[model samples]
Target chain A: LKTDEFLKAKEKINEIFEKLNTIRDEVIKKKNQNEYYRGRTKKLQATIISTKEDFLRSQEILAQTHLPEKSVFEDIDIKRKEIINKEGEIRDLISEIDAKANAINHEMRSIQRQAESKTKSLTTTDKIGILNQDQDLKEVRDAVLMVREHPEMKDKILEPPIMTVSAINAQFAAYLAQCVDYNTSKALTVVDSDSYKLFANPILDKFKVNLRELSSADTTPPVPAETVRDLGFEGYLSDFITGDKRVMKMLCQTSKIHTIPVSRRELTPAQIKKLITPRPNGKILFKRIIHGNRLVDIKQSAYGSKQVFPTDVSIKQTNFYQGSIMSNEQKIRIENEIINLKNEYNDRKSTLDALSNQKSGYRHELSELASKNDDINREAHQLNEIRKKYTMRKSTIETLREKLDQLKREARKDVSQKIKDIDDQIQQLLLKQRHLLSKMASSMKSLKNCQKEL
Target chain B: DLSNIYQQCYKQIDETINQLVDSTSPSTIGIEEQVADITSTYKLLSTYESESNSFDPEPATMVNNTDTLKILKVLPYIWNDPTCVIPDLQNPADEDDLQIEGGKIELTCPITCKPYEAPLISRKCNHVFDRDGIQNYLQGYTTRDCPQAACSQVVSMRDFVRDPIMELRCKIAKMKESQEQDKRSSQAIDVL
Candidate 1:
């Protein structure tokens, strides 16, 4: 009967202790699961806060300009809504993850009871030794089991909704690109015609088409790398071509738009002082005596007879009559046309300048986003460190639990005290584990809030 | 011739007056008696007198028992008795002592140049102030406080009087007064 009882007690102790080991494992595994999502939530939160600040700054710069007749924020409204929607999604996902965590905790408690229930079969001495060894192992086992079973918990906690962030990034790029194309087109239009003759007509026509397209199209077309490369891709040019080509096409004009290269006419130095000479602002000193195509004043005289006696020379009959071909008529027509074209050109030029300025501002913002993206990537790196620490701690707890169990298996007289010591240490660890969970929860909540806002 | 007779007569009269002035009174003879003893005794002791007998006088006396011998004892061998008409003595005062007057002696200690009275004593250092002067300097002031001279040690007045060697210094004023009186008397004798 004594041998039978001892054998049964051994079996009972093994069943009880195994349950303890399972509980210990669960606690460790769950704690690590919490750490990961906590980090993910934080990185996303930083992205949202940074993006909002940058957009507000860009908006302030835009506010000074005469924007389109349409309402303001027409372009960015969709992106703003997407960000808000992503925040809502994150809050819902975290709530579901927390619910799953609570369910796992319930399983841990049930597992602990099942593992410890075998104490009924043991002798008083064996019961004391076995119970000492099993209790801590059981608690840790329950904690680990509760955590390990929800293996997908880590993934749900850390992953951000990438779609909304990408949408916002895309919108900002298009806005800047549109502004740059507008300005570059206007600058090309009224530039000296003859000097820029090679690019003038096409450039002017591009401006016209871009303006027309911008008025009509709601969204810009996407460009492939290959097509853009064929268009002679290099440096800042790809940025201009990639978003929308019609915006570039609208600025180009078909007709020859003249610009007066000279603000003042060329007069011989001697003619400047002569009272008989004609001044550029249309103040003439002499009257015509005979009609001729050309006349010039003498050195000292107020008026001189180049052909007839009168001082005023009538070259208008000859030059003004040859209207289409004459240099004087061409000069007046070219100057007037240049003035008229520039007035029209400045309207678009002002917008282009405004957009060019806006593009520079966006470039600064895009640079910031790129750096923040790098930051998120860096924050993700901390997971590896946390994993390493968790692994070392898990192995240590396992080794300690194993030692207490093996000593009780030997039936050593001091086994009670040894197992008691291990229990005390395990209790301390369990207390510490509670602290870690609270800390982990706080950090995780912080991260979730961050991602939500982002 | 009459002028020569008058000149001879005036010379004789002047000679007569000086002869009359040379005659002595009783007080003068007593002083002459003391001088005669000093001169004769100095002439006798010039050969060298022995001090073997304490009671014996160094030379035979020239004076009677009525005259005190104290004057003979103090008379120095070099004393000059200028009161004599001849201005000479068998024991005349020495050229250095001739300037000394009555009651004033140049008493100086052999050890230090300090001069005081006939009976002076040396102290811790050789010095010559009287018992009273040394006592006054110490009692009223202090030993190192003596204005007499500068010395290193602070000696007491008792210490000053205890010294064995010192000399009397003739007070210089008496010597100067006596010299002047003698000079006037010598001039009157020359005129005669």
Candidate 2:
């Protein structure tokens, strides 16, 4: 053949091959993306469906606890129990979701590795050529390799024909990872629900309250229903609400107020325990109450600082101030001028008891007498003691004050003398200081003159 | 001879002159001592020199007070410098108007929930104590939750300046104050 003819034919054949390669690459890229999405989509679909199902189940649990308005006689305790069982199941379902979510994640990672390997082999420009070139031959070789490698993936491969084999593989991998997080989140809500039924409800029952959404309290700025509920008032105004959806849905929604989904592996078991328990915020919310080399807040207490419990604190203040300090003072002058405020705390208590006794004594004359009589005798006696003590202690304090005043005067005198000495030294120092400064000035002036000369 | 009185006095004068180059404080002492020593020596020497002119006291007038007067005139210039001794006291008291708050309040490390007996507090915020083990952790982390062991309420020295107290007695007060300030700021936060 002539060289010109051969060249023309060669060009035609190359053009055809190039066209086929272009078409092939487009198909393969599409197939690859499709497969990736399919895998991703499958997991997403599963998560979406499961999340929907969990919501549905939550609705069922809500239905079980739904109570009619004005049903005061209803045993909320029994209702709480029923909710517990249903919620427990919900929790288990969520746990299952949680487990599967992790599996999905692992699968996604596997898919990612596979996609990476394939991507490495084919450049973007040559992808068409690579995918279109003798796929059958590659498959046969792949079969042989698979058989040699123990071949469990053989049956799975039959589910989808290799019409776009690469994309399908990527898709399968995507399907798994997406569910990991989605399922875990769903499971957490269920777990929260379950935990609430057992640990939270009793506290709520004790407070016997519900949200403002449930009842309006004209007595107060409708104490936010959630706050009331949290304060243990879930059952107080049960008669005020009419729907089954009311309490259950309200709790389901509002309990999520501070419920942050913490990552499990990031925290320790103790942390997890803390997060799950009630009153988690109490320890974290307050300011740290540490004192000098000692903890004086919730952790411990010491002299001159407040104690944790009011009862213990009351006793401490009562004993230290009222019994020891106040009881030991001299109050004669104080009594002559002003009445001493003794343990008016205790004195008031006895007075209250006497009044109560007189009221219940049930005789008309006695009640009138009790009402009229000012039993200020015992009060006067305690007052005299307090006044006497206050007077004596005040004198001691006066003596100490006088000593303190003298010491302060002495300290001030010493400081004043120091100042005077400094002034006297300064007086002599003034003339010399001027001379030195003058010398320094002259040296600088000479140095400047020298620089000018240079 | 090496022991001639004029030569000895000149050498002592040279030593004192060198010290007088700056302040006369040291020179005054030096001159006084040398003068006393020379005077004693002169008195002894005069007793011997007087053998030649014991009754002729005409030379005594030659040395009366002139040299001592010159030394005294120079002494006053060494001890005082008006420029240095009287500083710019009138610079303004407001220049030193340090906004020292009512006082420093210290907060204990809430993580350990341990009260600071005497805590290092932040000057700006008066946060009483160090979040004991948080500095190393914070160094590695650009952003992290405040790791006060017992307290989870988030705090940061970045947000709240740590001004440690010099005394432990003031730790609690300073910490409490800082904590109150922190709470106020947190409550006033209009944005996340």
Candidate 3:
């Protein structure tokens, strides 16, 4: 009844119990895995059926079709010729549409020039002398050109918006031209007030070019691109207008480019049926949505810009980036002429859009037809291959089936054998448990004897 | 959109079908009434097709000859039977396909000894006999003989079964029988 003797007996009993528990756990674990093995066998069986069906289905198709190799080649040749002819027609159509757009563009330009030529604003030279021909801008250019010879603040006196930033497109250009007055459009940006005073210096011989001051490193609140997406505003004018960072922020300050909203379509009931109306968000106040050649306060009008307002303004695209362009007036007379020309331009644009849509569809059709021809060839190949394979791969799949069957049967038996293996371990554990029970009995008897002795 | 309208036509047909077959309903619309509803839907579809034109806003998608070829193309992908391979384009193309033969399926009935109609083929012998003739021939005996020229087939009444392959052959022949003494060219001695 010593402590070591009791300890030996205790450890022996617990080890026997632990062995028994492990054997039972192994049996359950093997049983759980046994089902998974059965599933593996079932899948193998399933694949065998599927492979057989695959073999049969391919053969079935082989028996059905009546394609002749030479005839199919002939058909393929015929289809290719048709495709070539279609492509030729498509090319012809594309050039035709381009001609139409060109005509429309020319017509628009002629109308604008009729209004322009009536006035004295014709450009005698290239883009440089084009806008510079104006008496006012000419004087500014002469003064600025004089400063160009001077050394100090030369880099600070950057070119004006008229030449510096070209419009991304004609609509943006026209919208921008309307939103800005002649002097503002000709205004140049200086890096800071130090550069500002150099041009706006000494009133007597002051530079005619308007100068705005902006800092390069200054940050502004983000007007994220997505912010005014569906407000029926084309987008912020600044989004489209791009140039130097300082110059942009400079004009962005004066021209309010970041805040300016522009669009080039009339808001009509018919279009609204197809599209969402330019809704006023009380949050941002849906103030600006430019309607085809006119910038309007959308919230003000219900149907659909600020200074030098976009009042169906004629965009005289004197600079090369955009137009040769418009007129409404002799005031009202030119306005009528420009309005009529605009409708013509708009009608041509819609025609052009629909033609392009059709052109693209034809392009897609061309691709699809080519693909279909290739598909036909591939089908012919596959069909012939199916015939060739009619007698091929049969033995391999059969062999696979036998081996798979062999594996499936083996696994089925092995699953049972696994449980038997666990059962054998359990049997060994049971014998150990019996042996431990005898030790446990002796330990209990000794404890009783030790208690009596005490 | 017009495209969506075409989609609606199919949806209406399917909805009608689903309602007819729906298991949740306590009572059922019987087969005849279901047929009526189905027929009505099908009639609308026929009218829709007849009324439809080139400028119907959208072109309806249809299976073309190329689509059929494409179907035949993908069908052989299931098995990797290596004996079959695409023949490269070569002058040997004529030689490869010289073995092609026109369909020559038998058009006559062995029992009637004439054109086939209401065909019943012997599963044992794979010989076509008219159903009425076969049944009459079977009733005359205990049903052991195949009436065709082939001698060895022992067949029961059940053995003279409806084979789809033979029946399809019968259909093919029925269409082709017009070719034997077709209206293309003929001479008659008398008005009769």
Query: In candidate 2 chain B, where is summed lDDT lowest over 10 consecutive residues?
Result: B77-86
Highest-lDDT candidate:
3
Residue-level lDDT tens digits of model 2 in B1-192: 112222232333333232322322232333444334433433333333333233543444333332332232232222222111122323434433224323333335544555444333444432345544456446777655644456534455665543322232333334446545644643433121
- Cα displacement (angstroms), candidate 2, residue A116, comes to 99
DockQ of each model vs. true complex: 0.00, 0.00, 0.00
lDDT of 1 by residue, A269-327 (tens): 22323344543544443321111223233223346564332333312222223223234
- Residue by residue across B1-192, what tens digits does model 3's lDDT show? 122223333343343233222211111113444334433434434344423532434445552312112112221221222112333323443533324333323335655567655666554554445677766655766555555467655556674566432232233233334422332211110111
Candidate No. with top TM-score = 3
Q: lDDT for every model? A: 0.34, 0.34, 0.46
lDDT per residue for candidate 3 within A1-454, as digits (tens), equals: 4433434434544553454334334434433653464465455556556655665655544442333344656765766686677577667666766665666566556665444333323322224544543566675575445545656545566655555555564435544455544565665546566666755663226655556644445575644545754746564555566656655555544544444554443353224222123334523333344444444332233222321222333344322222223422223343325534554666677677667656766775676677577667667656766644633455455455566657656655664576457546545644443343333233323222321233
Assess every candidate by TM-score.
0.14, 0.14, 0.24
| Isolated chain A TM-score, each model | 0.18, 0.15, 0.32
Full candidate order by TM-score, most accurate first: 3, 1, 2
- Model 1's CAPRI class? incorrect
- Report the C-alpha lDDT of model 2 over A1-454, residue by residue, as the tens digit: 3222323333433443343234323333332443343354344445444544554454443442233323422544444454565455545555555554554455445443334334222211112222222354444334333322433223222111122122223222222112112222111111223343433232233322122112234664422323322321232211221213312233323332221111111211222122222244343332112111111222334456543441112101111231322333644233312222323433465455455444433343443343233234334434555545545554554455455446445544554455346445544553444343333222212211211232
User: Model 3 segments beyond 4 Å from truth?
Assistant: A1-121, A124-127, A152-154, A168-176, A179-181, A202-204, A209-220, A223-226, A232-236, A239-242, A261-264, A268-284, A298-454, B1-192
